[PDB]
Curated annotation (Swiss-Prot), chain A:
Organism listed in the record: Escherichia phage lambda (Bacteriophage lambda)
Membrane spanning stretches: none
Shown residues within the full chain: 3 to 49 of 341
Subunit structure: Homomultimer. Interacts with FI protein.
Family: Belongs to the lambda phage major capsid protein family.
Protein name per UniProt: Major capsid protein
Function: Assembles to form an icosahedral capsid with a T=7 symmetry. The icosahedral capsid is about 60 nm in diameter and composed of 415 major capsid proteins. The assembly is primed by the interaction between capsid assembly protease and portal dodecamer, and major capsid proteins assemble cooperatively to form the procapsid with the help of capsid scaffolding protein. Major capsid protein forms hexons and pentons of the icosahedron. Viral genomic DNA is packaged into the procapsid through the portal vertex.
Length: 47, 49
């Protein structure tokens, strides 16, 4: 009943989470319209 | 060099200098290659399906 409680500041507690990989090498993004995806690479070796 | 001919003898006569020639004539190169007209039927690795 008679409590008289006063609340002070709270805490935060977020992660130490920064990608460094969605920002350095994976800068380019594409959506899909198909089901599978190919990834072709031509071996460039002239004679 | 000059060496030392004394002032009593005529001395020897030097061959002046010079003479060297050469030839580097032919050279060639020709990379012929084919277009393969029947290669265009199938799909290239490019040109997304």
């Amino acid at each position: 009943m008679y409590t008289t409680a006063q609340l002070l500041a709270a805490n935060e507690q977020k992660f130490k989470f920064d990608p460094l990989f969605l920002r350095l090498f994976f800068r380019e993004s594409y959506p899909f319209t198909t089901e599978k995806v190919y990834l072709s690479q031509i071996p460039g070796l002239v004679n | 060099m000059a060496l030392y001919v004394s002032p009593i003898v005529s001395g020897e006569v030097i061959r002046s200098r010079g003479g060297s020639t050469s030839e580097f004539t032919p050279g060639y190169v020709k990379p012929k290659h084919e277009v393969n007209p029947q290669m265009t039927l199938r799909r290239l690795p490019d040109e997304d399906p």
